[PDB]
Structure 1
Amino acid sequence: LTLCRCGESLQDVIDRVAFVIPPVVAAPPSLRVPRPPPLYSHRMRILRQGLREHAAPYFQQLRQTTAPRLLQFPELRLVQFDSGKLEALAILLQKLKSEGRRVLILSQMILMLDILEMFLNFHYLTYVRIDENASSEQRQELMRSFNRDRRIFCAILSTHSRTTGINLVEADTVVFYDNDLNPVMDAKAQEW
């Protein structure tokens, strides 16, 4: 029969085991290895025969080998929870998608662009990022791919490039995530 393995009402056991895995081994080393400068042929042959015998039943595969855990990466939730700006952005994007309007996210730091990328991936919102690294023609190609493609929801810009290549707008919704208050940057930014 099927059991819950815990106090929760109903949930997939796989999800149960995957949710709660805080601890990783403190300091697991490799196995010990005797080092006799001479290695007698008898013992080495016996060990090779044993290894061959143990490798023969490979049809099991040990079900992924159940290898230990040694990384414990941080949860993706923390990307949003770490900043209220990202929670407000999540609420705004959910509202706009319920309304069907695309969104144009504007940020100043490329690291903030990567943060926004991870955030949208946490929210599964398809996006197209246009930054300074991409050449003018590459920026125009990215903007063309964003345009006429209703499957792309968000567009992320750096606000530091010229951005004179953009031609058409999709939903007429912009979100100024960051404010610079710089002499020339903000002016031309808001202008275009």
Structure 2
Amino acid sequence: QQLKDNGHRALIFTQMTKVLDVLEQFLNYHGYLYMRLDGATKIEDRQILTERFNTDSRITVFILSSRSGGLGINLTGADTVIFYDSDWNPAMDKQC
């Protein structure tokens, strides 16, 4: 709520897909426009949705899987990142 009031767009990083589903349900109840990136995303679809998030300014929250970040992709359009849960490997958070 504070981030949306301030005009910042948040990035949710979690560790397991079930938490992705729970978060999706929560933010769907709260009406936030969003897109989700998961492990099962296709390569072309992954790139296209990354470009969509970078270009579109109407989706406030964007959800990632922390483990899938090992293959990095440009996400310069963000303004704040939220770590729902922590990982044992700090380099994964560093690349996130």
Do the two structures share a fold, i.e. TM-score over 0.5? yes
Q: Distance in 2 between matches of 1:135 and 1:102?
A: 24
Structure 1 segments (4+ residues) deviating >3 Å: none
Within the alignment, does 1:191 sit opposite 2:64 as a pair? Answer: no
One-letter amino acid of the structure 2 residue matched with residue 111 of structure 1:
K
Structure with higher Rg: it is: 1
Tell me the equivalent position of 1:14.
Answer: none
1:87-131 CA distance string (max 9 Å, x none): xxxxxxx00000011001100110000001001101101111001
Higher RCO, Cα 8 Å, sep 6+: 2
Query: Which residue number in structure 1 is paired with residue 23 of structure 2?
Result: 116
Structure 2 segments unaligned to the other structure (5+ residues): none
1:144 paired residue among 29, 51, 62 = 51
Q: Match for residue 82 of structure 2?
A: 175
Among the aligned pairs, what percent are the same residue?
Answer: 48
Superposition CA RMSD, Å: 1.4
Aligned residues: 95
1:49-106 CA deviation, whole Å, 9 max, x = no partner?
xxxxxxxxxxxxxxxxxxxxxxxxxxxxxxxxxxxxxxxxxxxxx0000001100110
Q: Which has the higher strand share?
A: 2
Instruction: Give the unaligned 5+ runs of structure 1.
Output: 1-93
Tell me the CA shift for residue 158 of structure 1: 0.5
Task: Mark the CA change 1:102 to 1:158 in structure 2 (over 3 Å): closer, same or farther.
Answer: same
